[PDB]
Amino acid sequence: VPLDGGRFATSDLNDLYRRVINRNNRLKRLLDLAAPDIIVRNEKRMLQEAVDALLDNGRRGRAITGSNKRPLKSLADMIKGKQGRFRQNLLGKRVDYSGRSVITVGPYLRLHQCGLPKKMALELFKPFIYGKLELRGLATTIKAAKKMVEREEAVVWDILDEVIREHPVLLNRAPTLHRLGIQAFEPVLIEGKAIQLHPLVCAAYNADFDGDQMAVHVPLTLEAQLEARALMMSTNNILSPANGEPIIVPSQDVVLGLYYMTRDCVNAKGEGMVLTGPKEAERLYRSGLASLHARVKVRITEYEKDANGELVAKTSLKDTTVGRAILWMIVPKGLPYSIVNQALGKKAISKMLNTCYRILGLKPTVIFADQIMYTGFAYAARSGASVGIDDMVIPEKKHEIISEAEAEVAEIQEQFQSGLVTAGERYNKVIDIWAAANDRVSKAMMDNLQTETVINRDGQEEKQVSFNSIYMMADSGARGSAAQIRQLAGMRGLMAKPDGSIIETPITANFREGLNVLQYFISTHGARKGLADTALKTANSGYLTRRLVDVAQDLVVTEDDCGTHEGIMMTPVIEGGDVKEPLRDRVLGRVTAEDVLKPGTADILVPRNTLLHEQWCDLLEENSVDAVKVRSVVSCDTDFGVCAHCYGRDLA
Amino acid sequence: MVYSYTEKKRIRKDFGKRPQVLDVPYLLSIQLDSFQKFIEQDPEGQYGLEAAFRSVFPIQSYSGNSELQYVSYRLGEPVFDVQECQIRGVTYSAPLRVKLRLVIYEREAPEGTVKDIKEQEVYMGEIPLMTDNGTFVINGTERVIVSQLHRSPGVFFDSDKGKTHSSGKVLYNARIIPYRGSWLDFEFDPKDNLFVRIDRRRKLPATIILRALNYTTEQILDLFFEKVIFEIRDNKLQMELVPERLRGETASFDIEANGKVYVEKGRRITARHIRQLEKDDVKLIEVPVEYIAGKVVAKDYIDESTGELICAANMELSLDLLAKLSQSGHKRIETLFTNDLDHGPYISETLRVDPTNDRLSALVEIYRMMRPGEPPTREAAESLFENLFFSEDRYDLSAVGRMKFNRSLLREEIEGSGILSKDDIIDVMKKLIDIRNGKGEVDDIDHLGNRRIRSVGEMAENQFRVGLVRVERAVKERLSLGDLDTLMPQDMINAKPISAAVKEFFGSSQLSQFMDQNNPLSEITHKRRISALGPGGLTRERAGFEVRDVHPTHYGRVCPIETPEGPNIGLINSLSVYAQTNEYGFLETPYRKVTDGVVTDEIHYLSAIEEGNYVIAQANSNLDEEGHFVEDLVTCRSKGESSLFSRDQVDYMDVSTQQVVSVGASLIPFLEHDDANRALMGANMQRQAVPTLRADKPLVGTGMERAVAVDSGVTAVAKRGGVVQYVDASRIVIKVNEDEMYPGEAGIDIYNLTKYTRSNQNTCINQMPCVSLGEPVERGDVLADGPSTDLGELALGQNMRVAFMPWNGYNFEDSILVSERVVQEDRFTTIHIQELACVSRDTKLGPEEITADIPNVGEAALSKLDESGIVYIGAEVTGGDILVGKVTPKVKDSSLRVPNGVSGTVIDVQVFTRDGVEKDKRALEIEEMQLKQAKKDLSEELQILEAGLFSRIRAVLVAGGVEAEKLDKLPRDRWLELGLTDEEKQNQLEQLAEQYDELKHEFEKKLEAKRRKITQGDDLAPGVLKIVKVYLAVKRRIQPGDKMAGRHGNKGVISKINPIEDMPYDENGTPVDIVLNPLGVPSRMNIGQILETHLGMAAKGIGDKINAMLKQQQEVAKLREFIQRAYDLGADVRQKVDLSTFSDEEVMRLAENLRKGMPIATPVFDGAKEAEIKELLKLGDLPTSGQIRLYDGRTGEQFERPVTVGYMYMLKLNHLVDDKMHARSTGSYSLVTQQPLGGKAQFGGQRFGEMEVWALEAYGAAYTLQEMLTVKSDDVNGRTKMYKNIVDGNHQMEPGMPESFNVLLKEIRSLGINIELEDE
DNA sequence: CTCTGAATCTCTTCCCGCGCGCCGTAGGAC
DNA sequence: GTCCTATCGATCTTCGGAAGAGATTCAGAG
Ligand SMILES: [Zn+2]
């Protein structure tokens, strides 16, 4: 190919072929002219080495180059390599009808929608627009259709709003470690240039919105659209394929809102009255006559579906809070009130959502999740749970806990000053004393944080859970766990050298107070060690993923039952004393290998090839069964494939 | 205390406590002082081009019997200055001229020359120069060469456990690293056999070197071992005993004599035994033959009669051997001390492995292993060995290398030659053996006492040396074969090798970084950047945690916070604020000299190695204003360990709390309260901020701006004191006061401010004035504010009023909610200047033309084009418009159409044309405009200078015969012989008249030269006839998707531009601008931005009180009364300001510059405590809590519980969305494989990686994959049939086969492989 | 005298996208 | 100047990779 000006870009293979041709022509010329044996031998050696350079340049003693020691790429070089054809153009290839942009969070979107810019929509769905301009008869042909599209005529926007009506778009973030990183969304036009993404979905993408780019691909053919809508739609991926854990786990902000709404206070406005129903309760809050955390009795009604599957309505008076009664207007008609009668956090809420999928089904679950997100955002906005320096509390006893602990180290030093202790013993006593002091400081700080709230209930002061901003952030599980609040309000504690040695002098300060120069320099060791750990491990993880996919790419569930009766026995993991995981986790979702026996003798409990779903897992846990043999993919006797019965439950 | 006039406009309140004893030095002196050491000639030839020449010249031909020697070099002045050179696109350099003296001696006569030819400074090459900002102009592009950090030359000892054979043991290895020459490594085999290698070649026995050094086995054994003697006198084989040699070891055999037995068999030996033995005179003692049998002899001993070897060096003795040899007449036997723990046999073990015999054998083995395929020869093995480590051409320890080497060997002297000596290698081996015995310690490779910094003046010197070595290689042969008679020194040398070497180094080296001119801070932090990469260093993909992790000796020299996290953390570093480079190249930092019990005001620089020998007090220690430590015991660091030490025991103290950080971290306030990760992110982000349109100031800073903005070289600085005379936003002219005026010079100094000019990141860098006409200035004052700078203080962004609260989730975990007001105020709008070039080449089919008569185009697009074919300046354009009317012969409509998407104003069009081809009309007009401007500038200069000079002449004529009538009668130029007595006043008049004549001629010659330069047909180098440059200005605003960030590592894209109604408002009705998220604060431990916000509130509150007192016509006395209180508030702060001396004029001026909030300084680790923030909030009527109650604008309700509200300083990062949004339907396709192109500047599509394919396979989607990898991308026939159906509305694909796959087959079919498809 | 040990040789390998931005045959003979 | 041929066919291409795996040598080993 030529470049700018009357010159042609250098080609690697061309130069190798040129060398080979020149050498071979010289050899032919000599062999015609009967050159001496020494000369013809040297020419033949040079020709052989030139062919070597042409084929697999680099396997020679030294690769040839025509530039600043940049060796020329050969045929074998072009075949293999990370930049080679296999991994550069065949396994992964650039695709038309795609784009990318910086994403942003749109809370108004439904779970199954995403917003895309009008410009990107026009530039991706261009042919489809043409497919209407002829069909509408508004354009003569492609020649005028493209011109009209360029004219961005106001009618063309109507054509776009008709074309994009039900056409899914695929969104995937780079990297995409697991299948949940690529999902289909129903698009909606947005004025801006950023891609509107849903909050509940951002967990699956691991998508922080701090300038994160993301790509869109348009499925063109009919089967592609149907496959996207049936397999890759957001609402079809509510369970993680790696374990029975929802991927729509409530976000950090939403859970704060729910935690704030359902919490209860001792004395509050509108306390103790009787409400005729949840709706009235809401009115009270919006009229300002009652506080959200006020304790009240509201008449609750709940529906419970029978063993056959039809809901049974039961109504009762319930002692609860105004926030819980308001939230109960969103929970679907199949759940007990006890799930919402508690201060919800990132754990407590999650099972709640899961329970819906356990009972109601997928369609109620998705709308319930959307309503939970809406309510959480709204009442978190109403909360205004700001954070300030006034909220970081230093326990007053801390100065004393230091003043004693250091003195104890002095005593450990005094022994070393008297020869009464060895070198190592002094170190391993000082560090242990400092650790005990750090534990005491942390416990005092936590106790002060929870105790900072005490209130009068019509008489005499009474304590309660703390409405401190940091405490509600930590307790709801949104952000900032105990290890964070401990460094923000307790003491930073011990640190480690780059060789891992424990620092004898801990960082006795906390970030609310100033850290001194030496303390910050000590912290830099661990900070840079962690950063380097991340930057180095991000590569080994990917290499392991590639090895796994390339060793396991072949297996597919290609048969119903292999008919085998072997398997593997599942027992709870008991090591280091107490059990570390139960039996239910291992055996859930597999089929039995043989008939499951009743605890005892001669009595069976489960058939020999029955899937052990949740009900049978509960039944087994009801009995004292510890070892259960179940079929496994390794033992399945299916040739060039894996039987379905061994694999068992599809976790998604 | 005295405040400078630039400082005496905003007296920034400072919360510092410690008195800064040493002001921050020049931040770019790392570069200049290095290059200054390069270009400057020096009689001490070292450190310069003279050193490079003396390292090569004199150069002689041994066969030629004639030499040429370097005399001197004088550097010609640059042809083009920085501005012109950048505009035209040439390099900024200087021509090097070298005097070479070619001396021809005579055969059959002494070296008395027949003739010598001294060339008059022959041309040698063009060397680039460093502009005063510290940057080089190479191709118009402005570059900065980062200073490199690598292992210092010397000797290093290292050992590891587990990494070698894992068997508990550590292998000790020594290395000799010359500055220029061959490596030499000594190593111990796992079986304690000592070997050597050169350049990591194959293992060779160490003793062979001594055989090469011509040492006999007797000599070597005497050098390395101790002698133990046995005699055959007074008894059979008595031993000379050294009692100290027996200690700890159990005496496993009988030794008894002279009454008492010292130690019997089977017992250890202690000190009292040694004392008894020393009293016993144990010079001779009884030992059994078995103990004598286990020894190994030290010397050869032949049969004296027959002359045949009966014993040899390192031969192990035995009973029969002993009897025989003693019978032969050698009664005094000497053996080697071989105590296992103390005197290991390592050298003897090497002897046992040695297959070589003597010096000939040594040379043969060395030659064979060094050069396979090359036959050894006595005359040539020397030519190899001497060149290896003794010949200057291939071995040279630098001065620093020799110093480090002697330090490692504990030599008394450091001044030594660069070539190794026999005793030098012997000492290296001795230290290695001692370390193997465990009598020493291994060095730390990643210790700042072993790694030294190379800068531009050294790498450029080395490249010049390489060029000169090549030149010498050529011209030695030329002189050997030349006739030496007709030759002249210009014939001997040609510039091409030297020019190519230096040009390649300054244009495309791994360390010739392209400058990231995003803002002044980026420039400074890139000029003071330290890199461990580059040639002679390591690589980003072959380094582990050991070199990346921070080090206890980095303190005070390298910033532990500012490192580019990602692929190369810890390899790229930033030099600390106060650190400076030693003479040898190491980094040294200043410490306050602590004398006995007082901290003196004496700064001594300590290096990385010296610091361990002292005890250094931390800079946070308190002193009683008498210099004494108030604390009885003070925490100090001694040897990396830090612990408490008693007062008056310490020896040094750090000079400032900012000695540990760099400028990027120094600018961040409340750095003490931020976790190091967020500190690193903030430091990295601060240099990515785009200069906004109206950047003003930070409310909360650290006072480092007053230096960073000044030393950046981007602000116009008054060279001398004086009074401003004229300002027009382009040229500020200063009447420099006569106190600093040169007697003959103009006495009036111009400053041509630079207006809108594109930067390396396509930003505008215009400088705008801040001084007023008639304002007095002093030398060093900032006259014109550059980009991101205002009133001499660095200001990257704007101080926005922010609140911490969730707001319907639009600030979800990274997102930012921004009021419409900030976009209405143009808070964040910024100008981007893009450069588009339309080239035209003399193609093989004929010369191209630029014309408005372009074929196949209507007048619609020609509307913007002129009569010549170029857009009129100031015309607003959008994507697709024709900007240049180029035509190609044989005709084609190749013309510059605006790239899609971008739109803006054309503010500049420069057309560079190769001459010979006729100039287009508009080029003539532009050239005439440039010529008129140049003539006007020169004429204005000369006429203003003439006015000043004539006024001075009249002033002189005031005394000495003043005659008003005769003075105003004639024109002022006819004052040649005006009435004045025979005094020195007429002499001054004649001097100034000669000066005026000189100014006349200089004006004439400069005008003619400028006209010739401008009229010159610009050199379009490769076969090209004309190029037209166009510059487009885009006033980019802020939109959702744009990225904003604080100074505390907080970053996020703005998610919604909220209208003013929906924003929360406080009880005063003031709405907040930005709504941030609170949950991000406790998670990432960046609590600093909270406190700053609180302080920022108070910082505005004071302003809110001043503005009213300015809006209400308060009397200045009362106004001052308030302001002083805001300044005197706090603890015993370092800064003290008495506003009384401001005469109320500077008081009103300060208030006019303070009504927008009083700027506050909070030093890095000497910052304001919370109590002072509360006190300052108390001064205003603001709440001492820091949190206010807000009202939701949509519903009028009050948020439950107060929220934090303040003024956080926010910066618009250079990652705006419109530069990154892209989508492709159909367009370019690649050639070799028909997959679509890749990129943004090319209409390319996203790459569907292997992970995406795996994810698609995870679902059952097969049709999706088949489409994605056959129709969309690869199958050429299919992707058209798909296009028709999609237009037809059929939505059906015909996959076919991916074309790329077929290409693969050919690549395999091109080999000896027949791979083919099969039917069944 | 080789056999069946180690030990010492060379070769292969190292996350995904995304943007900037430069920089890109050479010396010698008619 | 053009256009040519050839490619350290008198140097020293970098020493700041690790490891992991074979393949290839050697070594007492009977
Ligand atoms: Zn099976």
From Swiss-Prot, chain A:
Domain of life of the native organism: Bacteria
Binding residue positions for Mg(2+): D208, D210, D212
UniProt: Zn(2+) 2 binding residues: C562, C636, C643, C646
Description of how the protein assembles with itself and partners: The RNAP catalytic core consists of 2 alpha, 1 beta, 1 beta' and 1 omega subunit. When a sigma factor is associated with the core the holoenzyme is formed, which can initiate transcription.
Family of this protein: Belongs to the RNA polymerase beta' chain family.
Protein purpose: DNA-dependent RNA polymerase catalyzes the transcription of DNA into RNA using the four ribonucleoside triphosphates as substrates.
Protein name per UniProt: DNA-directed RNA polymerase subunit beta'
Biological source species: Escherichia coli O157:H7
Range covered out of full length: 253 to 904 of 1407
UniProtKB/Swiss-Prot annotation, chain B:
GO molecular function, one term: DNA binding
PTM summary: Acetylated on several lysine residues in the presence of glucose.
Effect of D675 to A/G: Resistant to antibiotics salinamide A and B
Modified residues (N6-acetyllysine): K1000, K1178
A Pfam family recorded for this sequence: RNA_pol_Rpb2_1
Effect listed in the UniProt record for changing E813K: Disrupts the enzyme's active center
Keyword Transcription: yes
PROSITE patterns tied to this protein: RNA_POL_BETA (PS01166)
Domain of life where this protein originates: Bacteria
Substitution effect: A665E: Resistant to antibiotics salinamide A and B
Record field: catalytic activity: RNA(n) + a ribonucleoside 5'-triphosphate = RNA(n+1) + diphosphate
Statement on biotechnological application from the UniProt entry: Co-administration of salinamide and rifampicin or salinamide and myxopyronin suppresses the emergence of resistance to both antibiotics.
Gene Ontology CC terms: cytoplasm; cytosol; cytosolic DNA-directed RNA polymerase complex; membrane; transcription elongation factor complex
InterPro entries in the cross-refs: DNA-dir_RNA_pol_bsu_ext_1_sf (IPR042107), DNA-dir_RNA_pol_bsu_external_1 (IPR019462), DNA-dir_RNA_pol_su2 (IPR015712), DNA-dir_RNAP_su2_dom (IPR007120), DNA-dir_RNAP_su2_hyb_sf (IPR037033), RNA_pol_bsu_bac (IPR010243), RNA_pol_bsu_CS (IPR007121), RNA_pol_bsu_protrusion (IPR007644)
Keyword Acetylation included in the entry's annotation: yes
Keywords: Acetylation, Antibiotic resistance, DNA-directed RNA polymerase, Nucleotidyltransferase, Transcription, Transferase
GO BP: bacterial-type flagellum assembly; bacterial-type flagellum-dependent cell motility; cell motility; cellular response to cell envelope stress; DNA-templated transcription initiation; intracellular iron ion homeostasis; nitrate assimilation; regulation of DNA-templated transcription elongation
Functional summary from the UniProt entry: DNA-dependent RNA polymerase (RNAP) catalyzes the transcription of DNA into RNA using the four ribonucleoside triphosphates as substrates.
Subunit structure: The RNAP catalytic core consists of 2 alpha, 1 beta, 1 beta' and 1 omega subunit. When a sigma factor is associated with the core the holoenzyme is formed, which can initiate transcription. The rRNA transcription and antitermination complex (rrnTAC) consists of RNAP, NusA, NusB, NusE (rpsJ), NusG, SubB, ribosomal protein S4, DNA and precursor rRNA; S4 is more flexible than other subunits. In pull-down experiments interacts with CedA.
Family: Belongs to the RNA polymerase beta chain family.
Name under which the protein is recorded: DNA-directed RNA polymerase subunit beta
Organism (species): Escherichia coli (strain K12)
Record gene name: rpoB
